Amino acid sequence: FDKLDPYFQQGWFHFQKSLYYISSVKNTWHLSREYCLQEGADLAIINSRAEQAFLENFKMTLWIGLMEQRSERTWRWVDGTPLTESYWSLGEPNNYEGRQEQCVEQIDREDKKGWNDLVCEFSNFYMCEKRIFP
Amino acid sequence: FDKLDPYFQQGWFHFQKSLYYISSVKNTWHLSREYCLQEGADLAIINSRAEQAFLENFKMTLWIGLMEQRSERTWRWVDGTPLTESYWSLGEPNNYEGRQEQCVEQIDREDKKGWNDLVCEFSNFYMCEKRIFP
Ligand SMILES: OC[C@H]1O[C@H](O)[C@H](O)[C@@H](O)[C@@H]1O
Ligand SMILES: OC[C@H]1O[C@H](O)[C@H](O)[C@@H](O)[C@@H]1O
Ligand SMILES: [Ca+2]
Ligand SMILES: [Ca+2]
Ligand SMILES: [Ca+2]
Ligand SMILES: [Ca+2]
């Protein structure tokens, strides 16, 4: 609580040893990330099935901290770790209609939930994550 | 914090002294309340401006635990406390079109944010709150 209370007072909330922040504006993937960096954090990194479920239940399209390595169709989290367990929604990732879809969102759609690759210059609400305890 | 882990494994999350649960289905105000009771909780009770802001930032229409006393246009939280500080959206509460709007939702609309009285038999996602720390 000494650690957490200053963050709660700014609208962060706590799930399994991280704090999370949901933005009140949409932004490009890069400027979303810049906000989280400025807060001493980063875009959210999904490390378990439970954290994915927690993410999905906000019923909100959210940028998360996963981005393609160049155009290689391989993926790295913002902390540098490679993608291992994934929650792509059906049919994704797909560089839809031949567009460069290098940044990852969590989608909120009827009959389609999970991650989607999207153009990084499109805008979404975004979720920051700060690990508090190891 | 160890006692939060079973709740976190079910998708609850921690803000200030409470755990919160956002439903994955819509329901009537009364059946929403029944779900929260059977988890040892109740519908959410808004006790401060910070908690209202926390609620508003989910950008979700949610039943919360405020309900009219009969048809008297006075209000009581599900824990029995009378309404004191309030966050009605502009023009609310209003018994819209002469309907009995006895139950309270947090609305997520353009140029209209805050609470709204609504027919209790209508359906919304709902938020449970459980006080964990004294
Ligand atoms: O608008 C961009 C998106 O459009 C559609 O939802 C496609 O399913 C998805 O793959 C694409 O990235
Ligand atoms: O449809 C129910 C609601 O409709 C409109 O939003 C009115 O502004 C609100 O007062 C009423 O409760
Ligand atoms: Ca994480
Ligand atoms: Ca895509
Ligand atoms: Ca409360
Ligand atoms: Ca109303």
Domain ranges in chain A?
A: 18-131
Q: Please tell me whether A110 is known to bind a ligand.
A: no
- Ligand 2 site, CB within 6 A: B 92, 94, 96, 101, 116-118
Cα distances from A28 to residues A21, A62, A64, B18, B94, in angstroms, run 16, 11, 11, 33, 39
Substitution candidate for ligand 1 out of A116, A120, A121 with most atoms within 8 A of CB: A116
Atom number in ligand 1 closest to CA A117: 12
* Residues contacting residue B21 through CB under 8 Å, at least 6 positions apart: B10, B11, B12, B36, B39, B41, B127, B128, B129, B130
Interface of A with B in 22-51 (CB under 8 A): 22, 24, 50
Span from the CA of A65 to the centroid of ligand 3 (angstroms): 10
Alpha helices in A5-132 (DSSP H): 5-8, 29-38, 49-56
- Cα B75 from Cα B6, distance rounded (Å): 33
Resolution (A): 1.8
Way the structure was solved = X-ray
Substitution candidate for ligand 1 out of A66, A73, A96, A103 with most atoms within 8 A of CB: A96
- Cα A121 from Cα A131, distance rounded (Å): 27
Q: Which CATH number fits domain A18-131: 3.50.50.60, 3.30.420.40, 3.10.100.10, 3.30.230.10?
A: 3.10.100.10
| B15/A8 Cβ within 8 A | yes
Which protein residue's CA is at the shortest distance from atom 12 of ligand 2?
B118
- Cα B4 from Cα A20, distance rounded (Å): 16
Residues B126/B91, Cβ–Cβ less than 8 Å: no
Q: Which residues pair with B115 in a beta bridge?
A: B88, B106
Identify the residue whose tokens are 């289905």. Answer: B25
Q: Which residue of A has its CA nearest to B15?
A: A13
Return the SS3 of A55.
Answer: helix
* 3-state SS string for B51-119: HHHHHHCCCCCEEEEEEECCCCCCEEECCCCECCCCCECCCCCCCHHHCCCCEEEEEEECCEEEEEEEC
- Could you count the other beta carbons within 10 Å of the beta carbon of residue A29? 25
Q: Which CATH class is domain B17-131?
A: alpha beta
Identify the residue whose tokens are 């824990």. Answer: B79
Return the SS3 of A87.
Answer: coil
Residues A106/A64, Cβ–Cβ less than 8 Å: yes
Interface of A with B in 74-113 (CB under 8 A): none
- Cα A127 from Cα A22, distance rounded (Å): 5
Cα distances from B114 to residues A84, B2, B86, in angstroms, run 41, 34, 9
**Ligand with the closest atom to the CA of A49:** 3
| B9/A14 Cβ within 8 A | no
